[PDB]
């Protein structure tokens, strides 16, 4: 039974059995429903929950014209790169937030789900790239990165490196290298007088 009174399916985003790699991050659009962010913030299992341009307390009291739910995986030390005005291999080459970002960033350690003994190599991240990504740009290219002036012709080797690279998550790693599942909510405020929202 589907109705618009029904709440938005945030379970599908947070409660997925597996996330995408950060270089090819997923984007779900939540629309034509009623969202309740009270359950999200109240959860005591979110090690990172930073919101930009909007306080999480006034989320249910706000009017959005559009909502995006981006989800991926990185390692613990790389969580601090998922914020406006950051750099690093993740913010420059994998996922970049705008300087006027209006949304929230939700992260939780997922070492019981995305690390295997012997290394879970399923998750990848782009390491080599000529110029930085633009905000909300996804690069799934697999072209051999040419470092020198000698072309590589698609072949790996010296000055000719694969742009992607795996995390190899092992449960014995330090928390700075353990897998962390991330959900980034992008809001689209309604241009309306204060007397409304």
């Amino acid at each position, epitope marked *: 039974h589907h109705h618009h009174t029904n709440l938005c399916p945030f379970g599908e985003v947070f*409660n997925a059995t597996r996330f995408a790699s950060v270089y090819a991050w997923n984007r779900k659009r939540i629309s034509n429903c009623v969202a309740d962010y009270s359950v999200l913030y109240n959860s005591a299992s979110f090690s990172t929950f930073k919101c930009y341009g909007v306080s999480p307390t006034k989320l249910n009291d706000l009017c959005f014209t559009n909502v995006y739910a981006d989800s991926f995986v990185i390692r613990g030390d790389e969580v601090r790169q998922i914020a406006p005005g950051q750099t690093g291999n993740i913010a420059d080459y994998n996922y970049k937030l705008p300087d006027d970002f209006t949304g929230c960033v939700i992260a939780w350690n997922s070492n019981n789900l995305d690390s295997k003994v012997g290394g879970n190599y399923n998750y990848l991240y782009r390491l080599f790239r000529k110029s930085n990504l633009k905000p909300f740009e996804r690069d799934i290219s697999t072209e051999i990165y040419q470092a020198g002036s000698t072309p590589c012709n698609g072949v790996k080797g010296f000055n000719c490196y694969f742009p992607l690279q795996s995390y190899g998550f092992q449960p014995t790693y330090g928390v700075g290298y353990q897998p962390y599942r991330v959900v980034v909510l992008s809001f689209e405020l309604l241009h309306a007088p204060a007397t409304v929202c």
Partner: antibody
Framework: VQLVQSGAEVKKPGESLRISCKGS????????ISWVRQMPGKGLEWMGR????????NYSPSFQGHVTISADKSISTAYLQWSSLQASDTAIYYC??????????????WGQGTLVTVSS | DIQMTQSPATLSVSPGERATLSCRAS??????LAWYQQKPGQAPRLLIY???TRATGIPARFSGSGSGTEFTLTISSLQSEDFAVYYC??????????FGQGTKVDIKR
């Protein structure tokens, strides 16, 4: 939370067969239903598992080239199919679920099972 | 794959005594283990998941423990409806889910 399998079957060796297992009350479209074999007096042996929404299998090495597992998320139903049955396949077949709970996994309901008897 | 081996094969415990069941993994499994109970003719029933967490609706006399490769299921104060076969299944997320052979719990005599 509720899974319902198909009724007991009886087939001659070499005949095709597919049993069903419908679920309900799942956390989200992305769960982990799994098939498990149990011979008359043997023990438990895992076979495969699917995420219906994604339909991504993970067949067990001892079962990969033998049975095919499919799913139809419209009816939230999981399937287990034999292209050619042999007498060794005579066993009880359960389906179990494994929902995700952010931090970790959690197995909930366990199918009542379907008895299969391959004999000519 | 990750071979699961249990011990002993079968045991014997009087009502009220403490049953002790072990489970060994061929390589580390962190803590993603689960104990089950299969009474004769019935479908298996989950008792412990995550090595130590008790399933909701299960008597508090059962308890699980361990980490890495060795684990233990303890049945404090054994009852008369506790006679079955107990297995240990691991469910590391991007891995073949493996199963133990089981252990049978009986009346001491």
């Amino acid at each position: 939370v509720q899974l319902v399998q198909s009724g007991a079957e009886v087939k001659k060796p070499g005949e095709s067969l597919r049993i069903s297992c419908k679920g309900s009350g799942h956390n989200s479209p992305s769960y982990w239903i799994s098939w498990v074999r149990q011979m008359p007096g043997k023990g438990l042996e895992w076979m495969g598992r699917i995420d219906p929404s994604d339909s991504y299998t993970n067949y067990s090495p001892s079962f990969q080239g033998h049975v095919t597992i499919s799913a139809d998320k419209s009816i939230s139903t999981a399937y287990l199919q034999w292209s050619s049955l042999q007498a060794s396949d005579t066993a009880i077949y359960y389906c179990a679920r494994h929902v995700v709970a952010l931090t970790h996994l959690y197995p909930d309901y366990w199918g009542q099972g379907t008895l299969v008897t391959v004999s000519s | 794959d990750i071979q699961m081996t249990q011990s002993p094969a079968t045991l014997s415990v009087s009502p009220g005594e403490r049953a002790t069941l072990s489970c060994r993994a061929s390589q580390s499994v962190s803590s993603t283990l689960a104990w089950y109970q299969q009474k004769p003719g019935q479908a298996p029933r989950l008792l412990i998941y995550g090595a130590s967490t008790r399933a909701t609706g299960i008597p508090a006399r059962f308890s699980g423990s361990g980490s890495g490769t060795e684990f233990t299921l303890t049945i404090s104060s054994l009852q008369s409806e506790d006679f079955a076969v107990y297995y240990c299944q691991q469910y590391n997320n991007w891995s073949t889910w493996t199963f133990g052979q089981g252990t049978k719990v009986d009346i001491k005599r």
